[PDB]
Design a protein around this ligand. Structure first.
Ligand SMILES: CCCCCCCCCO[C@@H]1O[C@H](CO)[C@@H](O)[C@H](O)[C@H]1O
Ligand SMILES: CCCCCCCCCO[C@@H]1O[C@H](CO)[C@@H](O)[C@H](O)[C@H]1O
Ligand SMILES: CCCCCCCCCO[C@@H]1O[C@H](CO)[C@@H](O)[C@H](O)[C@H]1O
Ligand SMILES: CCCCCCCCCC
Ligand SMILES: CCCCCCCCCC
Ligand SMILES: CCCCCCCC
Ligand SMILES: CCCCCC
Ligand SMILES: CCCCCC
Ligand SMILES: CCCCCC
Ligand SMILES: CCCCCC
Ligand SMILES: CCCCCC
Ligand SMILES: CCCCCC
Lengths: 437, 436
């Protein structure tokens, strides 16, 4: 077993790369419609996200079980909520890969503009998705080595700006666009949170991958907190720097603010470097999220809470069949990129599936308290405060989401309940059974 | 069985809790679609009958006090028990606000000062406490009162559904077959958006099983009988009215039974209809308050709700829990003091209606997960009926407003946080961690 485990550095880079992914290069454009007051939103977000990372760090320290959220939910609420957690999270992992491959290949269209035709884009995205399924089949050491390189590459423009763009930063420029939302202070913060709360999806990555991590009781907590801290610093420093270097009006309209600012600062090679690095961050993220889909489904199947095919492994313990099934499913949904109307159709699916992840987060918070109270000792109030902050993070993210996406998430939970009952009656053990027939 | 409730009053509680305010307003709500609503009714009644059979069988297997709450606890454990009771308890007493406003509004036919929002609010508060006090007198009292109220409310509904056919004209009905502007499926969906919600209350006997005589026999009978009564009345009366009153008038009418009666057999007929419709709403207040008391008492008895809700007088009535519900309803009844206050409270009311479907969903799950050993050779029929019942619940949500469902989702999240923060160290885990 020990020979197929992933070390601390690649797992930390997988956390930070799964978090920062496609979004990091788009954040400044998204927050430009609010303005520099977004710094307040960032403060709230980073406190909530750190809180949630600490929950995952402590829960994984107490229980480094394969599958992360799934395992915790099963421990504290039982097989039905474990089943629910895995279905939601597995769906979120592979459905989110469609949007991500489209973005990463889109960045590559800077070099090969043929990649902007919907048909060529769709074929290319299917190819790339299978590349990252195949790298996962080679194994977790391969996929995390690939993602570690891709994540460092993607950090080049982000860290570059965060450290050196301050030489061009102007506070006059930042403050001239302090609040362009047309909203009062609370509304402007809310419009920020509508973006930023969703920027830390992936904080659970090491916890979910604990079955393939070396010394997980030590490394999953470090990688979780460290990955979140990398992302938080990168986010704040880079979005702040950009808003002080580029007038708000241009930032609003830019589809690639880092790349549009680079291509016009240090020349065309700079736009090239940025586009390449941003593609690398996206595509590496594909590898990591596919790994996580295979891992959640294997852990659930290993407990009899998902079809047995998802627990079938090769000699190294890789769920090869599960990874192939995810590849097929992603290929089918990837057809959505074939036209603008096809992509608009698939869009609601993508938006709903992002909400799915918050239920795993909510149950992990619950589980830390419900399972771990005997480990808090004198620090119990601290554990209660941090976990309450993490709960608020999750709830606030939903409060600010579109009503239609949350409604279809509600419906999905209902369908999962019916599926569990119809598929698992006579296998399910009841905490308070009726008397014998 | 000194304080236990007999079969007839329990059945009338089921039908009266279901029919309530809605029955007299259904034809006006369906008139915007037209007579094609008959298709929607057919779909709804199959689904509602399905759900009633699920409740009937589950209560037969386990006549536990609290109904849905007790079943969810049995099959999914304390957390989902906790969730089921919180949701259902909220739905019961929040739904009473809209209920009492409608009931007192019917009485405005006699006393027009009741349309002044201030007098309306004061009167509503008083009436809510009247029904809390009757529940404190006891379940035999509250169910006797609701039985009489429910028979009164049947007078106009059964009167039209039996004798309205002398005046029914198929021409009139078919002239407004489909006025929705939608194709057939869209028109059916516009119907379902109204009709699926018209069977809330099917669970009433199940939840009240702790106060019912011989509940293992009578709760199933009352569940299926209450639903059949409602279904017959719904279909007969809405169909009759649509064949008696031009669609245009049916649309603009705020009380189609009352407006049609007042202009059919005179002012005395309008007065009769208004009295009976008020009686039906108000009696419902008593039944839904009883159910709030019962679900909270059952959950508190298992340590899954604050213990004050399990405090009982010598008769076993949760007097303090009923008083707490009275207080909560009063505070929110303040919403009827102005049009703006009422619209503000409207989102809360719509949201809380969705809550009930989670108890339904879990009761469907519980029947399969707990009762599979009792199905025998008829396993397929169980599986089919329960599947119909699941679809009924999911479809109801699929057609609801997105904002209402979103805030229901948020409520589930809050409830999960509240459970974790209040029950850690008391909650026992199915797969615990090793000792520190
Ligand atoms: C992986 C699970 C994701 C489930 C997401 C379901 C999205 C449904 C798309 O909505 C469609 O259009 C309307 C809303 O836009 C609906 O009224 C209509 O019924 C539906 O067909
Ligand atoms: C009791 C189950 C349903 C009862 C049906 C009552 C009569 C059904 C009328 O049918 C429909 O009438 C429409 C208008 O005439 C036609 O457009 C449509 O084509 C026809 O099929
Ligand atoms: C226990 C019952 C659950 C309560 C449901 C609460 C609904 C609160 C919604 O707030 C209101 O509606 C808008 C969203 O719909 C908000 O944006 C706006 O600020 C406000 O006007
Ligand atoms: C041992 C494999 C070396 C990994 C190089 C791949 C980098 C991929 C950038 C997207
Ligand atoms: C046990 C005393 C019965 C009282 C019944 C009064 C019914 C009034 C409902 C309108
Ligand atoms: C070692 C192979 C990594 C290549 C992945 C790049 C995807 C285009
Ligand atoms: C040895 C360096 C590890 C640091 C992880 C953030
Ligand atoms: C119940 C479905 C009816 C369809 C009529 C065309
Ligand atoms: C016996 C008292 C009945 C009161 C009806 C509202
Ligand atoms: C025998 C009395 C039991 C009561 C349960 C609340
Ligand atoms: C919600 C009411 C609780 C009362 C506790 C004493
Ligand atoms: C027995 C009296 C109850 C009071 C609760 C507020």
């Amino acid at each position: 077993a020990d020979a197929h485990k992933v070390g601390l550095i690649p797992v930390t880079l997988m956390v930070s790369g799964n978090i920062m992914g496609s979004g990091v290069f788009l954040l400044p454009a998204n927050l430009a419609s609010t303005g520099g007051i977004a710094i307040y939103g960032w403060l709230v977000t980073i406190i909530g996200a750190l809180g949630l990372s600490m929950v995952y760090a402590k829960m994984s320290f107490l229980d480094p079980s394969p599958g992360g959220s799934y395992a915790y939910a099963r421990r504290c609420f039982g097989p039905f909520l474990g089943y629910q957690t895995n279905v939601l999270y597995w769906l979120a992992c592979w459905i989110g890969n469609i949007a991500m491959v489209v973005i990463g290949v889109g960045y590559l269209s800077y070099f090969f503009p043929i990649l902007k035709d919907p048909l060529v884009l769709t074929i290319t995205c299917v190819v790339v998705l299978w590349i990252f399924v195949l790298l996962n089949i080679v194994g977790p050491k391969m996929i995390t080595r690939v993602q570690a390189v891709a994540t460092v590459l993607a950090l080049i423009p982000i860290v570059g700006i965060a450290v050196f763009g301050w030489f061009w930063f102007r506070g006059e420029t930042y403050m001239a666009a302090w609040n362009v939302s047309g909203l009062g202070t609370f509304g402007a913060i809310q419009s920020t949170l509508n973006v930023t709360l969703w920027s830390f999806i992936g904080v659970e990555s090491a916890s979910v991958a604990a079955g393939v991590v070396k010394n997980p009781k030590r490394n999953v907590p470090i990688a979780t907190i460290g990955g979140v801290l990398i992302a938080a610093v990168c986010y704040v420093l880079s979005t702040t720097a950009i808003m002080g270097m580029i007038p708000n009006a241009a930032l609003r309209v830019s589809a690639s603010p880092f790349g549009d600012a680079a291509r016009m600062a240090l020349g065309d090679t700079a736009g090239a470097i940025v586009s390449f690095c941003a593609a690398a961050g996206c595509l590496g993220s594909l590898g990591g999220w596919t790994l996580l889909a295979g891992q959640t489904a294997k852990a659930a199947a290993d407990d009899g809470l998902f079809p047995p095919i998802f627990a079938r492994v090769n000699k190294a313990g890789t769920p090869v069949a599960g990874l192939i099934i995810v590849g097929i499913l992603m290929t089918i949904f990837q057809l959505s990129s074939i036209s603008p109307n096809a992509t608009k159709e698939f869009g609601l699916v993508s938006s709903v599936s992002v909400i799915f992840t918050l239920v795993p987060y909510l149950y992990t918070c619950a589980a830390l308290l419900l399972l771990g109270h005997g480990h808090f000792g004198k620090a119990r109030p601290a554990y209660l405060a941090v976990t309450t902050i993490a709960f608020l993070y999750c709830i606030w993210a939903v409060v600010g989401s579109g009503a239609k996406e949350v409604m279809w998430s509600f419906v999905t939970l209902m369908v999962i309940t019916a599926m569990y009952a119809l598929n698992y009656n006579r296998l399910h053990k009841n905490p308070y059974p009726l008397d014998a027939p």
